[PDB]
A paper describes a structure:
AChBPs are homopentameric, water-soluble homologs of the ligand-binding domain of LGICs and well-established structural surrogates for nicotinic acetylcholine receptors (nAChR). Importantly, AChBPs can bind nAChR-specific ligands and induce similar conformational changes as in the membrane bound receptors.
The sensorgrams had concentration dependent distortions in both the association and dissociation phases, with a negative slope at steady state and signals below baseline once the ligand injection was stopped. The three VUF compounds resulted in significant ΔSHG responses with all labelling variants, with VUF22430 giving very high signals. Similarly, VUF6105 resulted in a significant compaction, while VUF24234 resulted in an expansion. As seen from the different conformational changes induced by each compound, this analysis revealed that the binding modes of VUF6105 and VUF24234 are different. The unit cell was comprised of two or four pentamers of Ls-[name] in the presence of FL1613, FL1856, FL1888, FL3044, VUF24234 and VUF6105. The violin plot revealed that conformational changes in loop C occurred to a higher degree in the [name] structures with compounds FL1888, VUF24234 and VUF6105 than in the other structures. This correlated with the results from the SPR, SAW and SHG biosensor experiments, which all indicated conformational changes in [name] upon binding of these compounds.
Author numbering:
A (entry chain C): 20 to 175, 180 to 224
B (entry chain B): 20 to 174, 179 to 223
C (entry chain A): 20 to 177, 180 to 223
D (entry chain D): 20 to 175, 177 to 225
E (entry chain E): 20 to 174, 176 to 223
Write the structure that this text describes.
Amino acid sequence: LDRADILYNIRQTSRPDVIPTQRDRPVAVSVSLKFINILEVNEITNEVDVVFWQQTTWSDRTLAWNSSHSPDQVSVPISSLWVPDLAAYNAISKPEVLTPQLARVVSDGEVLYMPSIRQRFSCDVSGVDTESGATCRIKIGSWTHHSREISVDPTTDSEYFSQYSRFEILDVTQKKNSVTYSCCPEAYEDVEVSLNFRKKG
Amino acid sequence: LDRADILYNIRQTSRPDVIPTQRDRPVAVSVSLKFINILEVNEITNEVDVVFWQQTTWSDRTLAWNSSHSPDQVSVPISSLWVPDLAAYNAISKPEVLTPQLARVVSDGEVLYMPSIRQRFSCDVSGVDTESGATCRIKIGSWTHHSREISVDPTDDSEYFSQYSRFEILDVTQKKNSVTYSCCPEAYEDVEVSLNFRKK
Amino acid sequence: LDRADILYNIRQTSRPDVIPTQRDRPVAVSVSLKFINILEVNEITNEVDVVFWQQTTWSDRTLAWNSSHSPDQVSVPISSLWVPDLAAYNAISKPEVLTPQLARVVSDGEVLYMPSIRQRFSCDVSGVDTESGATCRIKIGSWTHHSREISVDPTTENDSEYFSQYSRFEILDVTQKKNSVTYSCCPEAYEDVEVSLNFRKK
Amino acid sequence: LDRADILYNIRQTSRPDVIPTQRDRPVAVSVSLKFINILEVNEITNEVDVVFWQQTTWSDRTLAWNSSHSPDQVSVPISSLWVPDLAAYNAISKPEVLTPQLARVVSDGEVLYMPSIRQRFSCDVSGVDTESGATCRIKIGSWTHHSREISVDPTTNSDDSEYFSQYSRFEILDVTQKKNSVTYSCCPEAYEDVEVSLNFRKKGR
Amino acid sequence: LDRADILYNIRQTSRPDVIPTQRDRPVAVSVSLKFINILEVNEITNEVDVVFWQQTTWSDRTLAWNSSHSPDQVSVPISSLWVPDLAAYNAISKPEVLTPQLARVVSDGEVLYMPSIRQRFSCDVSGVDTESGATCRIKIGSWTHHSREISVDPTENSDDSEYFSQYSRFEILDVTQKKNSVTYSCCPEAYEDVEVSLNFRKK
Ligand SMILES: *[C@@H]1O[C@H](CO)[C@@H](O)[C@H](O)[C@H]1NC(C)=O
Ligand SMILES: *[C@@H]1O[C@H](CO)[C@@H](O)[C@H](O)[C@H]1NC(C)=O
Ligand SMILES: *[C@@H]1O[C@H](CO)[C@@H](O)[C@H](O)[C@H]1NC(C)=O
Ligand SMILES: c1cnc2c(c1)ccc1cccnc12
Ligand SMILES: c1cnc2c(c1)ccc1cccnc12
């Protein structure tokens, strides 16, 4: 009926350890990085330290509620929620969470989680000081769940990029991938985010 | 009641996950940054490292109590109450909280949480060596709640600044913003603190 | 009694969130900074990185026990206690506490928590290389409790005996005076202890 | 069952602090490091900064379920599992896990925990600029459980540099995994460790 | 008993905050530092950054079990155990525990806690580049319990210069572990120490 009841009901029935696979078809996770800032770039070590928005979207029907005389959306801490086990495959630092750790939950079960991450990556810095800039690929996909459980998909440049960064974005491409691990035959999916940037001076 | 009863009552009944909106109105959150120190400034990267008191104030009627013969205010760990999910939109580091995680709650339900935060931002350092100084804009607002849920508003902000930093405050002006994105048909409010400072 | 029972009574009753106000009088907290080492002096930015034992003392009779054939003191984790919410107003880093966070509890309710803390401060470093040295002031006081709830008092009874013999610096004097602020919002008085650290390079 | 039922049963029955033996036989722990990136090398201090996936495998039959009309394997938080108390014996930094701390649990009781860990080590860095490269040995073994309780043996997958960053200053030449049985703490019992030798060199620009 | 039962009994009955004083006599805690690596040395500031194994042994009779048809030793998370409140008096940094925080408990009540700790200390670094080396003393003892509650002693039964990294930029010459008793001039009680004199030099 009210916000307190929904968050009470959500707290007590949300199964955070349980992926909401429905009729055993994959959970469609939509990940798009909104780049905000690029801090320290190294063309020698091929390392970048970047701040970006991880727009993450999925549906968890275990959260749904009747909206007749009730809020249309609530704000839920992700500790009381299932969050996809996303990992940046080429990160060389642990993701540093800048924002409060809440996701927005819609009454129909849609979940919107977008944390601020400061993280270091190993990618192609060659050409960052040149005219056409450097192209840095960041690969994000489920860490443990394969294609039958989590399906990751892009939304398809950033308008939220800080004008005061020493670097500037030229183009951002994010495409979907499908890989196979060298041990095990089922298929693990990732989204490929290509960051085209250069120095200003 | 005496303090033990109130703090028992607040701990066991507070819905820390629940926003205390009254009759579908937004929680009036009052943000004023009291700047304490600027430690590292870098004009090449346009980054500042700042220590400040993030004075935050709101009203939570679920915390109130009848204070006829009882204390007028208590001190509650912010884990046992709902705190607005504020986030500095232009920060490049996680807030380093230097003070205890306690809030002040008055008998009527007003809550005052003012932690000391050392945090790095990306803002305009250009002109920090000049006479008129550099002006660094910091935009602070709720990360998940929109305008009908949290309304942010400002309330002498250079009275506690360290007389020992290589930097000095010239002017501090605070305006509030309200943005509507092409995604979301709701309005998102933030307080933008423009910090005028220069080199010694 | 015995240690196992005493700590049971403290564990099961002591209200870590509740300040032990008695007859609505302020809780007299006694703060004395025992400086151990000065680790990073910077005269350009006026910043010091210092390690110190924060001798903090108050009385909490909700912990007391009749000390017949019983221990006169035990050792209690700070999670099972109310600890004053002291904060160095001029600190520029999080306090890094080096020792385990146990406090000493006397049978009458007196509590002693004296942790070793490494913390960086913004204070007066100018003159550290001259002979009489620079004096760096540290202001520590309760962050939420005002003058009627927590009263801070220096101990004016003692450093230069626990300071590291291997430090690049040497302590000249340590003086503690009391302060009281009234902030522009609320007609309360908020108390802090101002610890003056007179030190120089050797 | 379904995933929710399995994870309910596992969450509510896990004795995570209890090592999962049976017939008082040692737990078959299989550890093999897949190196992902070499970040900082220091030839003067003989210190290396490395990112690697620590593929760890053991069998815990208490997690098993009848898989008839049921999921084949699920994903369980390592907080709801016993994980071997493995430690890099020559480490000079705390292990930093970059990935979610989830393990993969199969209906037969098999567990797959493969975290991406960035850690600094003390090993022989001398020769990283030569052609044949430097050899960095990493000693991994249980910190408290001995050979009769935890036996470490490295695993089988494929290429030694199949997940190694092509953008690292360095390139892997060979990755060797050897098993040992020596003495830790004091004297009796047999204490096993896996010795992972990392052959790497600077890249030829 | 089986492994799960013993660890259950310890979890539910171990008094982690309660010191296990025996016959109202002090708890004999035995400290031995196994030096593993010397990382950063600074002769001007007199600071060393060290990785070492803190081998700790004590007896807690409340932890025991009849070892009949049951395991003779288990590994218990120190969250379910009493661990002495040891602190390095000469430390200038957080002790960085690198290993899992499990302790080994024998059916007789003896407990073994030996974590790998990376910590910085303030000691005499002068002479680290010379032939005889510097002597860096590290004093380890209980932080809140005094001598009649906790008695701290070295384990000299220690062979510690045996696990040191051959690849450290520095080399150990001597390690002495002696017993000390430090009394602060404020207060009459005395806190016992292990005094580790670490004689090492640069290569
Ligand atoms: C508050 O308490 C006083 C004292 O009992 C009572 O007279 C008064 O009606 C109360 N006010 C409320 C509940 O608003
Ligand atoms: C405390 O000491 C005695 C001895 O056990 C105890 O019986 C008594 O109740 C207490 N004495 C007083 C005066 O309260
Ligand atoms: C322990 O149990 C064994 C048999 O289970 C028995 O022989 C022995 O006496 C017991 N120890 C004690 C002290 O009762
Ligand atoms: C700036 C601040 N908050 C937001 C956005 C941008 C974009 C989306 C969004 C969705 C829910 C809550 N907040 C935001
Ligand atoms: C420093 C510390 N605490 C405070 C202030 C300054 C100012 C106002 C205030 C109001 C209530 C509680 N604490 C404080």
